[PDB]
Copies of this chain bind each other. A is one copy, B any other.
């Protein structure tokens, strides 16, 4: 029993982290086979960053301008190229610690683990969700760019995020590992802003099931609601619509607890209209929306990874 915000074990990713230095800029790179991936704004300097032309900037660079450190071992860069907002540095050594991996792009509402890194050295690991507005509520300081987000499926690491920047509200934006940003953000200095967010309804329901599985039942009731009537309430409280596919995804958790999905919707409705009355759910006084149904099943059942 118990329910924690849980990340994947980070060892497979730690072995891929390197330090990339170009000019005055040092950030992190991801070393897989004989390529190091990193944010392309590494080729920028403090007056380049206002409105740079990266193609112009890159043709001016040399392989030897890129300093790559794998711990205390220097990797010779033998080629470079740009792919969207990432740089691909070809090195003369394949990473002997390369795990089985995939480059995947995730959906808003899905979760992943972040290995925060500085100077190519892992600092910490934590769990994030991709918000509906394509930002993530991370924890990142100067020098964290190139840190990556990932999921692990048995022995395969699915990389889904590389960190690029902080927005003015303190949330974070970045790209998939093909260099394509999540959301309408650019790797430049403009007045970029997040844009309105919503609460991930299916995740809140999954967490309520996590609570029931763990013995928190005070919010349960005998009432039910229809999907349409629930979604009218969701609209009003800035929750995203619940679809029939969400209902279907919640089926297993429904069956394990014996609480019909629409019955849990009725409970959520009352929580939204009444609040919590000084009470808590799984140690929170807010409705938590950064656990997916998968996250709940994995934790409340015990899936491992080799």
Binding site for B on A (CB under 8 A): 1-12, 14-15, 71, 115-119, 121-126, 128, 137-144, 166, 170-172, 214-215, 280, 283-286, 298-306
Contacts and interface: CB of A to CB of B under 8 A. Distances in A.
Which of A280, A286, A298 has the largest number of chain B CB atoms within 10 A?
Answer: A286
Contacts of A128: 4
Given A9-B10, A285-B285, A304-B118, A299 B139 contact: yes
Given A7-B124, A121-B305, 20 more contacts: A1-B166, A2-B137, A2-B140, A4-B126, A6-B124, A6-B125, A7-B125, A9-B11, A9-B115, A9-B122, A9-B123, A10-B125, A121-B304, A123-B304, A123-B305, A141-B302, A143-B302, A170-B215, A280-B286, A283-B286
Oligomeric state, in copies: 2
Contacts of A299: 124, 139
A304 B125 contact: no
Contacts of A3: 139
A215 B121 CA distance: 27
Which of A122, A215, A303 has the largest number of chain B CB atoms within 10 A?
Answer: A122
A122 B301 CA distance: 14
A137 B5 CA distance: 12
Contacts of A4: 126, 128, 137-139
A223 to B, nearest CB: 25
